[PDB]
Design a protein around this ligand. Structure first.
Ligand SMILES: NC(=O)C1=CN([C@@H]2O[C@H](COP(=O)(O)OP(=O)(O)OC[C@H]3O[C@@H](n4cnc5c(N)ncnc54)[C@H](OP(=O)(O)O)[C@@H]3O)[C@@H](O)[C@H]2O)C=CC1
Ligand SMILES: Cc1c(C(=O)O)cnn1-c1ccccc1
Ligand SMILES: Cc1c(C(=O)O)cnn1-c1ccccc1
Ligand SMILES: [Co+2]
Length: 159
């Protein structure tokens, strides 16, 4: 199973300036629940976005995708192609925009946290991948984060 997990503004923005223009503790907890114990695959930029203190994310097989054959990520596997990372029963692609797009053909699950933030798209933004007609999606209720933003979860699947 390859799944994608991400949070996006309504506009499709997932990242800006190498970080995220919001912070939902509830989505972090949800993220941790969904990925705990499994392989997490991320682009090198996303690895860089992780604070050195949470790095590697505990209890998960941290894999970083880089074309740099000598890139050192203390506590992770650095692989130069996505196929090297799919060697576990459950693999979660955790970002960023490039790796989401690269992984979409392998995916059967997308766990999408939609953040009700009017965030117009800007040059350089990392974007959520486009899901075609093969994806079947079920939505949750709009919830309120303690950060003040509303959010809801879309769970997409396809065979
Ligand atoms: N909202 C959310 O849910 C999340 C948002 N984000 C945000 O996403 C943004 C980063 O995403 P993005 O900028 O797209 O970069 P990524 O995090 O997708 O990593 C990009 C890097 O991945 C490597 N890479 C990409 N394609 C390939 C390939 N085909 N073969 C080998 N290596 C490859 C390269 O690493 P190298 O350059 O070393 O070769 C590239 O620079 C940040 O702002 C981050 O905060 C991240 C995670 C979750
Ligand atoms: C910080 C964060 C949030 C948040 O703060 O809302 C939601 N996802 N992530 C996250 C970022 C990078 C990698 C994995 C997950
Ligand atoms: C996703 C995450 C976890 C986790 O999933 O265990 C623990 N810290 N963070 C985190 C990452 C980036 C920024 C803030 C927090
Ligand atoms: Co699990």
């Amino acid at each position: 199973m390859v799944g994608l997990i991400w949070a996006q503004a309504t506009s499709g923005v997932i990242g800006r300036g190498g970080d995220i223009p919001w912070r939902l503790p509830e989505d972090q907890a949800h993220f941790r629940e969904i990925t705990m114990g499994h392989t997490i695959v991320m682009g090198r930029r996303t690895w860089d976005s992780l604070p050195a203190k949470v790095r590697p994310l505990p209890g998960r097989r941290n894999v970083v995708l880089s074309r740099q054959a000598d890139f050192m990520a203390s506590g992770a596997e650095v692989v130069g192609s996505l196929e090297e990372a799919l060697t576990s029963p459950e693999t979660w692609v955790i970002g960023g925009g490039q790796v989401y797009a690269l992984a979409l053909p392998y995916a059967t699950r997308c766990e999408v946290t939609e953040v009700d933030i009017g965030l117009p798209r800007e040059a350089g933004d990392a974007l959520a991948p486009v899901l075609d007609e093969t994806w079947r999606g079920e939505t949750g209720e709009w919830r309120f984060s303690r950060s003040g933003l509303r959010y809801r979860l879309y769970s997409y699947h396809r065979s």
